[PDB]
Write a protein that binds this DNA or RNA. Structure first.
Lengths: 113, 138, 59, 156, 117
RNA sequence: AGCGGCACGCGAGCUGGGUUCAGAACGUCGUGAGACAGUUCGGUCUCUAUCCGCCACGGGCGCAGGAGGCUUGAGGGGGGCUC
RNA sequence: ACCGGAGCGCUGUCUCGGCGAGGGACCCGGUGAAAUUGAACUGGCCGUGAAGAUGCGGCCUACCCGUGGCAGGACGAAAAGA
RNA sequence: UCGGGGCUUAAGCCCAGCGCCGAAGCUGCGGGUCUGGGGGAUGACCCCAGGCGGUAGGGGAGCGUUCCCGAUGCCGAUGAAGGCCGACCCGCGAGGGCGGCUGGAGGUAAGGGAAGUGCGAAUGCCGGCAUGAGUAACGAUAAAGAGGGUGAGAAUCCCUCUCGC
RNA sequence: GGUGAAAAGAACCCCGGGAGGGGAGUGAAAUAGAGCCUGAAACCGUGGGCUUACAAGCAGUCACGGCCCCGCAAGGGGUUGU
């Protein structure tokens, strides 16, 4: 089986979290745990969070056990954003967008035999 | 019908002399063989035109006053860096490079015409590495 | 908004090349002496430790 | 048009070194809610077409129907009073099944009332007999009434 | 009477889209640049119908000659042969038959040879 | 103690002395407003290099076994003076 | 505090520059924009062509992506020529 | 540097003969077309001779939209319109069906009327999203440090030793 | 400006600081999950098929060839070395 986990509508620009997830993109769960908690970011904490909540959904809902669990899929697609107006010298109507992400760790079977 | 296409036939190896030959007409044939243009099995985009090993190109002939008057030019990108070395001195020091570069201006230039210039082995001896066949020509 | 000005739209490919050098690099690790934990190399894991015994205070 | 827009009459931009384009007031079809070019207005598509011409029409209309023979001229009716019933029975007596149509000429409201609600049956009368109506349907019912009536319209 | 600009635009647009799908550039997506590319490609295609014809007749004669060389003499001779000789046909690529079954070829060779002799 | 070219080399490198902005003046023409291949004085020159290029420093693969050290110089670049 | 010429003292204005300090610039974590943008798989030379070429011919050179840095050019952006 | 190489009893020049390449020109085969001519009483239709580069521009034929009449009919729960797709058929073409997926409640033949009728550009109008770029910048050079607290989380909030303007 | 015929608009548990998800359950439909009908185009991205590290280019077209998938064959499709 494969446990679909996610956290839509969360602060953080794609590019960043995108690259944090691909740091772990498909690997052993223990690996994932230690890599997530021990690399210097903040999308680190986020993704580690959604991942823990991924292990949660396969442990008490579907039955598989972490022993045979590995990160299938992962992504992080962008939602909309906020659009905050930031002034500039000479009074330039300037906008700074406030991007937002959708981390999607899935995971499952190790063997099958 | 539909014109025929040769498989991976065998790269026939060949041998030609060098001496007593005009610089000009020499490569002329030579080159035209790197292209399977002598073969009734010529195909534009496939390169099956034989290998040309040459021997003793230390003693190539040429007409004109050439010998001295024939200059070759090389340009290194750095300014003022146009070098010219006469055929005169190209004979004394590394003489193959006058047979090489000659054919090199007698083929096309598409990537293969390069790979094909590779399909030719110049020496100023005779002698070579007797790899196989290389049955003489004229 | 001055002298230097991008003359054309940089290609998504180009984007992905300048990006081809980024790559969120992975860190490295080692296991904790006389316990089960993963500390970074030449460090003192919070709960764990070296040969001396300092800190150790996580509830 | 771009004329009765509740907008403005003011040039929003300066014109020249704006950095942006060159316009004026919002009320312009290029813009958003601004007016349209030549567009929708109140007209009269109708006109005056010769009586003679159209009279032929009237005549020719019935003429075609008569060229076929679908017109009855009963002096009066059997379903005299106002009831869908009796007209239905009479419609058996005329054989006007339930797959025909009545540009239904004759002059007596009671007759119209009965086949007023009927669907296969429009009813039409003679005071304003129009060729479109006979085209779309089939049953100049009547008395000699509407025929006498017709005759006057086209006799010269 | 309102004439909504409707779907027509996106319909024909997706048509051209389908056509130009496969290209590179933003023209592989841009319904505008795509189109321009199609123009180019169509013209290229026509010119290349006529072209392709030339391309091949060329290749043909290349091979033909190669064979006639390996037997007796050169192309121009040979062809003035058939042309004069008798075989008032051949189809130049049916000469390229010559590459397969050299026999019938060589027969034709000696024919054109002994022709104007 | 050469001459010449290179957008009379070089302002997305500097200068801003010359030049022809709006002020003011002297002569000067013009009744005049103003004007002058005349003149005097004053006068805002924009931080972010995207591509080619150019100076240096790496990463990817390559090098048709694998790894450490030593290397031939194909081809360049500097150098050239004078009393 | 207006515009010429001179001298005296003084001095990195110069010969002709050398070092040092901080705040930037550089790397790491968090936030993160602008004008410009036909599309780009964008090299020199010598020719060409609406007379000033990456793109056209000719030749030569060029392993694929950057980072710090330099402004010759892309008739560089800005201002529908004052 | 002659378009480059390379040519010297020539790959240069002069002279003559023979020969082959060769363009969408010309001929051969098949299709579309128009304009003439004929057999067609035959409109249909094959055959025959000649024509079909082409901006402005004048000219003829048609596709698609929106509504209307054709509408008390007709199609739609087995699915109306829009979309996703498609290597099949039709017309040279603008287009048209059919097939599968979506979706959910409308669509309207054949024959005819009518107009805000078909966009790629207007430094066009509104909308949304990339671009440079993880770069510039993160508001004064007065300046910060530790210990303890809280809480999931503190350089950044609270408490005293310090240090500065 | 449009969830749905109806609020039946999601009790319970689970991760989680909440934010949001993951079984259950609500209905024809949750591909109707709450600025939710039908969601097209750019637009960012997850995986797969083809090709790319000695090459000079309006990005295509002609042909040959290989690699990958339907097809009884003979034929078709996608990709790109020359």
């Amino acid at each position: 089986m494969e446990a679909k986990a996610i956290a839509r509508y969360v602060r953080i620009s794609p590019r960043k979290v995108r690259l944090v997830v691909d740091l772990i993109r498909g690997k052993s769960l223990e690996e994932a745990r230690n890599i997530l908690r021990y690399t210097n970011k903040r999308g680190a904490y986020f993704v580690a969070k959604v991942l823990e909540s991924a292990a949660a959904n396969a442990v008490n809902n579907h039955d598989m056990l972490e022993d045979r669990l590995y990160v299938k899929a992962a992504y992080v697609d962008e939602g909309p954003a906020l659009k905050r107006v930031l002034p500039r010298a000479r009074g330039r109507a300037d906008i700074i967008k406030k991007r937002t992400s959708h981390i999607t760790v899935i995971l499952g079977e190790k063997h099958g035999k | 019908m539909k014109t025929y296409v040769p498989k991976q036939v065998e790269p026939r190896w060949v041998l030609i002399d060098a001496e007593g030959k005009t610089l000009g007409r020499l490569a002329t044939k030579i080159a035209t063989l790197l292209r399977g243009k002598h073969r009734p099995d010529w195909t534009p985009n496939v390169a099956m035109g034989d290998f040309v090993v040459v021997v003793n190109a230390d003693k190539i002939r040429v007409t004109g006053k050439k010998l001295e008057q024939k200059i070759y030019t090389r340009y290194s990108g750095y300014p003022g860096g146009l070098k010219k070395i006469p055929l005169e001195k190209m004979l004394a020091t590394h003489p193959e490079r006058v047979l090489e570069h000659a054919v090199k201006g007698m083929l096309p230039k598409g990537p293969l015409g390069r790979r094909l210039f590779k399909r030719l082995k110049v020496y100023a001896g005779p002698d070579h590495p007797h790899q196989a066949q290389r049955p003489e020509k004229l | 908004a001055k002298h230097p000005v991008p003359k054309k739209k940089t290609s998504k490919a180009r984007r992905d090349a300048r990006r081809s050098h980024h790559a969120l690099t992975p860190p490295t690790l080692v296991p904790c002496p006389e316990c089960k934990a993963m500390k970074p190399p030449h460090t003192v894991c919070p709960e764990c430790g070296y040969y001396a015994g300092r800190k150790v205070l996580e509830v | 048009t771009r004329g009765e827009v509740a907008y403005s009459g003011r040039k929003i931009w300066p014109q020249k070194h704006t950095g942006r384009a060159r316009h004026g007031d919002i009320g312009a079809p290029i813009f958003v809610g601004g007016g349209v070019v030549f567009g929708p207005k109140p007209r009269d598509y109708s006109y005056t077409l010769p009586k003679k011409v159209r009279k032929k029409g009237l005549a020719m209309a019935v003429a075609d129907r008569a060229r076929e023979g679908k017109l009855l001229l009963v002096e009066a009716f059997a379903g005299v009073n106002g009831k869908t019933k009796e007209f239905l029975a009479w419609a058996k007596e005329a054989g006007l099944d339930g797959s025909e149509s009545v540009l239904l000429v004759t002059g007596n409201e009671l007759v119209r009332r009965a086949a007023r609600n009927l669907p296969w049956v429009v009813t039409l009368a003679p005071e304003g007999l129009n060729v479109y109506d006979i085209v779309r349907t089939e049953r100049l019912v009547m008395d000699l009434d509407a025929w006498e009536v017709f005759q006057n319209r086209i006799g010269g | 009477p309102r004439a909504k600009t409707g779907v027509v635009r996106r319909r024909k647009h997706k048509k051209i889209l389908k056509l130009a799908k496969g290209y590179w550039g933003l023209r592989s997506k841009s319904f505008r640049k795509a189109r321009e590319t199609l123009f180019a490609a169509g013209n290229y295609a026509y010119a290349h119908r006529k072209r392709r014809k030339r391309d091949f007749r060329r290749l043909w004669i290349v091979r033909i000659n190669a064979a006639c060389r390996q037997h007796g003499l050169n192309y121009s001779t040979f062809i003035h042969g058939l042309k004069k000789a008798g075989i008032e046909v051949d189809r130049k690529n049916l000469a390229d038959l010559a590459v397969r079954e050299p026999q019938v070829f060589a027969e034709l060779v000696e024919r054109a040879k002994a022709a104007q002799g």
